[PDB]
């Protein structure tokens, strides 16, 4: 399985440093280039630079010169990218790709490494319930929700009735408001299931070791 296999996710505060390994296996390592590509959140897939395994000298796009640096240990088939004085904009997934010398594409891609640069400290989420204040039947379906605000790191996990309810469940992407994250989930049940039957909102935050069950009570 000719693959380039990369390190795991990195969570760094400002000013720190990270070193990403990219292990090449299955192919003649000297025979290609190793390129580093940055995929930033809803920004372009950006090319950082390149390493030529015959000479050993990198090449860098202006945009990542100075502070990003690429080292190599061609005996050990490992390529490297080092980031120093990690700024907050470096949160992105960095990928390494083997480029080819005759047809110049990039054909084997590593799975990407996620760095997350932030100043926050672990914080358990506050979980609040969303019941519809006698906001009557618009049409025989109540949608309740849960709102889990103020947490770091990602992830959280929302379930409703311990996974016994999943066809009406929408959980929305996290959006960090002031360092910490926010997220909400809605379930839509038939009006005879709730409020006769209970609907519970179960959120677990693995990083902090906190699981909160909230019951949605009529209002």
């Amino acid at each position: 399985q000719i693959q380039l296999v990369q390190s795991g996710p990195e969570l760094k505060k400002p000013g720190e440093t990270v070193k990403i390994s990219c292990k090449a296996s299955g192919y003649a390592f000297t025979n290609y280039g190793v390129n580093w590509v940055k995929e930033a959140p809803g920004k372009e897939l950006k090319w950082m630079g390149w390493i030529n395994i015959y000479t050993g000298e990198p090449t860098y796009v202006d945009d990542f010169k100075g502070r990003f640096a690429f080292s190599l240990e061609t005996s050990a088939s490992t390529a490297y990218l080092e980031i120093n004085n990690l700024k907050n904009e470096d949160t992105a997934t960095y990928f390494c790709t083997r480029g080819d010398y005759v047809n110049w594409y990039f054909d084997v891609w590593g799975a990407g490494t996620t760095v997350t640069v932030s100043s926050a400290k672990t914080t358990p989420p506050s979980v609040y319930p969303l019941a519809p204040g006698s906001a009557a039947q618009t049409n025989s379906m109540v949608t309740l929700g849960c709102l889990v605000k103020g947490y770091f790191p990602e992830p959280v996990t929302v379930t409703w009735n311990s996974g016994s309810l999943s066809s009406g469940v929408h959980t929305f992407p996290a959006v960090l408001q002031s360092d910490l994250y926010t997220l909400s989930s809605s379930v839509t049940v038939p009006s005879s299931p709730r409020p006769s039957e209970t609907v519970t909102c179960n959120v677990a935050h693995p990083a902090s070791s906190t699981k909160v069950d909230k019951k949605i009570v009529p209002r």
Binding site: E44, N103, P132, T138, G145, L147
Partner: protein
């Protein structure tokens, strides 16, 4: 940077049909010895890009026989012939004809479906977020297609702008719809210095906005 551009951002496609994507270059792509290094990647969700077609018209090993390529110099187009369910993802196009290789924004294949309008639902703050101070009003503009919808937050007749942070869901694989939600995050004396709270959304389907409300 040879600005690489692709339209459309999102291409609804009924599976079975045939999709065609296009890309364009802020320079020309014939290299200094008659070769054209325009290549296209497919990125399936939370996975890697992977070479599909190189040098404009050549298909990568294994890449399925309905994919095609064409274009000269500055307009290139990818064509898929009977798009099957796993041709779906973000299709990117790149150029390594000029230093440095650049990527275009990509165009996502999306399933097409008859339109619907958002089931909006509007939630006030809970006693328990209130006994400590914030108050996040939360509207859920759920189960609609097509993706563009816009929300406005009417506060006592007036409008509010700082406080909204919206968040969108990937096209639901069971009925191809989208869903979206905005929580207006006010403090407890911004919330208690007001009364009418209405959430409002104009989506392609109704000329009139599909407002909802509670009176503090």
């Amino acid at each position: 940077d040879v600005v690489m551009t692709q339209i459309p951002l999102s291409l609804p496609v009924n599976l079975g049909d045939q999709a065609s994507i296009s890309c364009r270059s802020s320079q020309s792509l014939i290299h200094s010895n008659g070769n054209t290094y325009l290549h296209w990647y497919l990125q399936k969700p939370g996975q890697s890009p992977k070479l599909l077609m190189y040098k404009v018209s050549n298909r990568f090993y294994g890449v399925p026989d309905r994919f095609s390529g064409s274009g000269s110099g500055t307009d290139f187009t990818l064509k898929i012939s009977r798009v099957e369910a796993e041709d779906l993802g973000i299709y990117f196009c790149s150029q390594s004809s000029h230093v440095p290789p650049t990527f275009g924004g990509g165009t996502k294949l999306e399933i097409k479906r008859a339109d619907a309008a958002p089931t909006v639902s509007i939630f006030p703050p809970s006693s328990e977020q209130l006994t400590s101070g914030g108050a996040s009003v939360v509207c859920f503009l759920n189960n609609f297609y097509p993706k563009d919808i816009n929300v406005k937050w009417k506060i006592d007749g007036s409008e509010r702008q700082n406080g909204v942070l919206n968040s969108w869901t990937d096209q639901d694989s069971k009925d191809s719809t989208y869903s979206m939600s905005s929580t207006l995050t006010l403090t407890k004396d911004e919330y208690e210095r007001h009364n009418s709270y209405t959430c409002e959304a104009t989506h392609k389907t109704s000329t009139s906005p599909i407002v909802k409300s509670f009176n503090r």
